[PDB]
Symmetry: D2
Subunit: 440 residues, 4 copies
């Protein structure tokens, strides 16, 4: 699956539709990023710039100009072609090929942006600019606006109104199109295949990072070169650290291992967590905690649909958690009172769900306490967990247990579609999978 | 292999030895680096900070204070311990454990650096600071020095002399200790095993990125989680691009594939290039170019020793290249004249060798034209290549061929030790390896 | 004359009237300005901040909040009272006295602005801010907006729309109220008295700076402590330099002296130029040039009225200049052709008129080529001049002559009122004045 | 009096003498400084730049290059000549005239400094630069050093050592040459004449600013166009504010007026304070305080000589003050105890003396508590004062009295020379002066 030329075009038009007449929107590419000395990390495009272009180069600026309600055009600034720079560092689109390739009206050299941008903004009433996003972008934009402000004797005028386009654009990104859902569906499959493989490869005596290696290799073979975020393999007490990425410990028989990993496929994030026994057999104590987390997920998967909210489903999860923890003697007292005192928080201290898309923690307004009513096309995670500290004052057998189980869903007209259900989460199915792998 | 506590101690003392009395050296940690929105790339410590500490956290500053020729002490600024921040983002050393763990005399909270640093610099004559390295570091250092400058009524004085420690420290890093060589030896082995595997897995119809996946998985399984640089898998004409990292093409029967990849093991870089037939059998045209590159490497491996230079060995390589290219009719004319006109440059347009260590392109002075006399303990790459453009005006059969073969060596008392010779480079050994793998 | 409490109130309301509902306007005070080391220049308030407050302290911010069409309030940030700082550097308004003194609803300490400003902007749709005016202001405003942007979990939202209030405020400043005109009338009188005095004191052998001393003393005695701009006393060839402020030469019998000087009275600028013989008697050559400049001024004073423009009156001045210069043989050819070729420009190379108010070169839109139609309440200068270079290829007697004559006017319903006519400009009246003084 | 070409030359050589071989010193001109909108304050050169050049233009950099102990040369960067810019804003030295005019070896255009400075610093070991003095200078210097650092392949090297020249240069400025003393002598005379005049002009009903006008006019007529600092005319309770510059009040019969004013003559500061009765007759209460301040000054003038310190003379002044205040019943108790408790501080809360030169509060190290031993050629102020707050709990007749009396001295071989004694300070001489003037 991919995003079509036509889709990038529609998105640009959908933004232009909302813009004032006599305005320009300025969207800047991510800078290149140093890893050490003269070596750079693999390039990751700005998600908003990518969203309108699918163009994976730095030193690029998309300028969308709305003259009026029926007239608009696009200008791209991008790197010029250069034989020496390309022999060295790889091929460039250039100005000649860009109009056709990226569907823009005009393409200019990024080296000329300070000589050209103010000319494009001259006489407009409004400029849409994400101020503070990048310092290089702010320098360029402020420099242009000052030229116009100070150039009245050359008959230049600056737009007096600057508007942040991020609220508008992030609101668009919150609702996935069919194409986006198809891409995210494949990301979920790829990510699920990686998690299945990690379960099948796990043996006591392997290191946490070995499962990371298996996962990344599986991403890569389906064409998702990079993870959407740094992979978490927390065995034992390391599972109680929410973003444990050291992955440095020997995995021990008797311990659980929590894997939080997701591929990046055509820009879009998969995001799965599975927790499982290193030796392929849950203990009673482990099952007791796992079942509470599993019921929370399964109940949330049933409940999520248009018209509810993350807040509303979270309250149901809290009830399940508090009840299960009371039955185990991890909490003590009246369930409704304990719920009212938020007594689950030492054990479940993060949110149940976040938006998912071009960023793993995706853009879009949640509303107060994540109370926003859900609608079709929203994509989100469902990730209950219970984390019992090594030194929690609870029965010994529960101490140092971290369990999270996480699926990715899209809200549909009648409910949701689970994008990550092709990797098992029921404990008996996990155990069967691992037994089968150990035979073979 | 690893670097001992004692070794980090020796390095600190070796720096203090060269410092003026009444001085402090300030070495700052790398910043955390955004990949997209709120997600960050895996953390990579500043190589110089790492060199003196082996400490892999951000927001840390090593301060080495030389009172006089027999009196010095160390102060570390690092992140305070914090239950909430660590439950979330992972464990911290803190101030209590740091003196013993990192062998420093005193550890303070990084949050207090603006309140404490000027007190440490007060009354000193000299401050060693790598000005321009990081903007956050410059802000901190300038802020301290201004407090001292302006505080004469509180009996404060700033050191009037600021010295860049990078020349001194990079000169130290240029000469590897036995421990460093042992670590780099293992990096070379790990990297060689990865390249062997890529040759064994290669089949027509696989994508360039698939070999990248194999290579990274192999790094990871020996405990080198990350590459030292972005991996290059250039098949066909992509092999003529020196830092081709797109790795996006289907590998085609008949083409060569050039793999440039290196692991990062305990901070230290492996760096190997192997070029080989996608189908496991070099053609005549491919052999003809390959043999020139192979002779260049093999001759360089013989020649490298104390008392020669990269410049001197490069001249021998140019002769081999020009002669081989004339025999193939790719160059025309008198060899000595063609050599004098640098007629190899359209085909070999980079250096033969760079320093190798904590950075793949390592620190250390090369001298004019890389004429510096080599001495024992220097570590470098040996990487001749020939790149014939798709549209070079040469016989058709050589067009679009890129071949590089690269080994890593340490200069010894009598010559060099090859750290990467455990992966094959003789064409008949390559072919045998691939045939054996294809059976299975 | 002064500006009333009520007037500052009206101006604030006139701005609020034009603001969107759900918005705040932020107006910042000028920084203190170093003259050398720890000494500072006399403090000059930002003209726009002054316009809304009449408050002459640094570290102050006026915040005007429009909740809706009938609800708005003002918050001032200003320096706290401080016994030690005031014993040293002088009295402060403080927070307690400010509401009553400056007619604001609330006053807070400037030291708390980073803790308070974002709270004031929270939930608004629009912020009016003069971006780029002051770097300290931009830091404060950007810092507030980032807190709001990043604080959605604390239920904070930033206004997405930022509007430059300068166009609106400068448009207001372009039209003087009766009070402003009364203040500018007194500035014109004070400035005229200074110019009269300089004519009366001038003797050959005095230095240019001596007339500067006389002028400044006269400003000061009427309560205008500072000039509105650096005083120009250009005798001889120095009169051909438009902003000659060195004022370092001995004034010589036979030379003209050009004086451009203006007081600052209650924030408002006077701005007069008079040119006259150092010895009190114009030569024939001097009269010949002077009369052309004088006719240009006198004609412009007749012409200026509602419905004409600076551009239109300038064309009349060009005609007068070109005709007079042709009659003297300084220009050669057909008048209409010479006019069409802009042949006056080597001799008259600046504009005839600029806006006058809180700044000598006052704010307000001029239109293309200063074609904006004039209306009652606009205040402007009328300043024709002729400057014949020492080495101009013209008859010898005109070389090195600089003459400018400048008056300040307000456009009325039927024409204009001349604010500076109490200092003489007719040559015979100048000569009489100087003769009378020499007796003284 | 003036500073000779030869003197500027000697100073440059005296600096070069102290510089390391293989080094360059970089001294930057002051920026132009905005007063309001497009109007600028009168230009004031950086005191250190002036000290080596006597050059009064912005956008200039003096570069002194020491190749070795017998070889050095100077390069000036300054503004190019420009007919249009000079017709407008005044004459420029340019590159052609600068070598001869300012005694430098070479002059280049300031517009080329980024293309030229790194070439001048290339291969040097040390750069002397006043880091933090000006942001524009730091940008230029850091930019040059980065070009050199990153240009090893073009055989460029940066000096690794940066040294602040301010300690060295300020140490030079602390000791005035005969020429400097002659210039400061004339500044003292000019300033004294201004103070005499203010006493002679003072009448009840005049405003504080009127005496400011008289003072500035007198500065100007002797060729000192500008004050060295903002003039203080504190009548009545305003005399209790140390840097009262509002000068806005009507001077009232019965009150004292404190005048602190100083001219700037050839760059050098005069600095005098005189306090006197507005009506020309001290009251008993006023005499009682005045005599203590006068005895303090007169005693200090006797004591100041080589081998004492400001600290040592200050202790004598404290004794005089505490004794006088006890006798008046303003202090109560044992003198030695009151001295030990610093009981004078509510009434005398500033230092007795500061260095005087190109800055009124001049550069140069004071030592702890201003204990540095005085030597011939040091120039300083002597300024005891007593300030009794309007609400001090002391006998009614002393409340709201501020008296300071200040003279300027140079330390000689046997004592000091008083540069400001030509204006009277004995009360009977003040009264006689004012009576004589009133007749006017
Ligand atoms: Mg356990
Ligand atoms: Mg071919
Ligand atoms: Mg003449
Ligand atoms: Mg009294
Ligand atoms: Na998640
Ligand atoms: Na290499
Ligand atoms: Na004017
Ligand atoms: Na003083």
């Amino acid at each position: 699956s991919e995003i079509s030329r036509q889709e990038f075009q529609r998105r640009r038009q959908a933004l232009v539709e909302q813009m004032q007449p006599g305005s320009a929107a300025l969207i800047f590419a991510a800078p290149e990023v140093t890893r050490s000395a003269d070596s750079e990390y693999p390039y990751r495009q700005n998600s908003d710039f990518w969203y309108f272009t699918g163009f994976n180069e730095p030193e690029a600026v998309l300028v969308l100009i709305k003259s009026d309600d029926t007239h608009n055009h696009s200008v791209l600034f991008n790197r010029v072609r250069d034989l020496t720079a390309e022999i060295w560092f790889g091929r460039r689109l250039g100005q000649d090929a860009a109009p056709e390739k990226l569907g823009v009206d005009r393409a200019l050299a990024f080296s000329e942006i300070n000589q050209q941008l103010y000319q494009l903004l001259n006489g407009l009433d409004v400029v849409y600019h994400a101020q503070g996003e990048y310092a290089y972008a702010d320098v360029i934009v402020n420099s242009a606006l000052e030229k116009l402000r100070k150039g009245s004797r050359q008959n230049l005028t600056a737009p007096a109104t600057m508007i942040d386009w991020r609220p508008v654009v992030h609101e668009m990104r919150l609702f996935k199109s069919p194409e986006e859902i198809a891409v995210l569906r494949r990301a979920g499959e790829i990510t699920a295949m990686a998690h299945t493989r990690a379960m099948e490869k796990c043996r006591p005596g392997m290191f946490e990072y070995h499962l990371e290696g298996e996962i990344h290799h599986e991403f890569n073979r389906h064409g998702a070169r990079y993870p959407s975020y740094n992979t978490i393999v927390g065995s034992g007490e390391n599972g109680c650290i929410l973003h444990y990425t050291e992955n440095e410990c020997e995995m021990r028989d008797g311990d659980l291992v929590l894997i939080d990993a997701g591929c990046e496929y055509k820009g879009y994030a998969g995001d799965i967590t599975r927790t499982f026994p290193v030796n392929g057999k849950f203990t009673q104590a482990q099952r007791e905690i796992y079942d509470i987390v599993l019921e929370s997920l399964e109940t949330s998967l049933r409940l999520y649909r248009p018209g509810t909210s993350i807040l509303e489903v979270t309250g149901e999860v809290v009830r399940i958690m508090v009840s299960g923890l009371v039955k185990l003697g991890i909490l003590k007292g009246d369930v409704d009172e304990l719920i009212a005192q938020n007594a689950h928080r030492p054990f479940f201290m993060h949110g149940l769900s976040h938006w998912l898309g071009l960023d793993v923690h995706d853009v879009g307004v949640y509303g107060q306490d994540r109370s926003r009513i859900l609608e079709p096309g929203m994509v989100l995670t469902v990730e209950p967990g219970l984390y019992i500290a090594p030194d929690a004052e609870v029965p010994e057998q529960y101490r140092g247990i971290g369990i999270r189980i996480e699926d990715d869903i899209v809200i549909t007209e009648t409910g949701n579609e689970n994008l990550t259900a092709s990797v098992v989460k029921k404990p008996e199915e996990i155990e069967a999978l691992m037994v089968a792998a150990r035979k073979q």
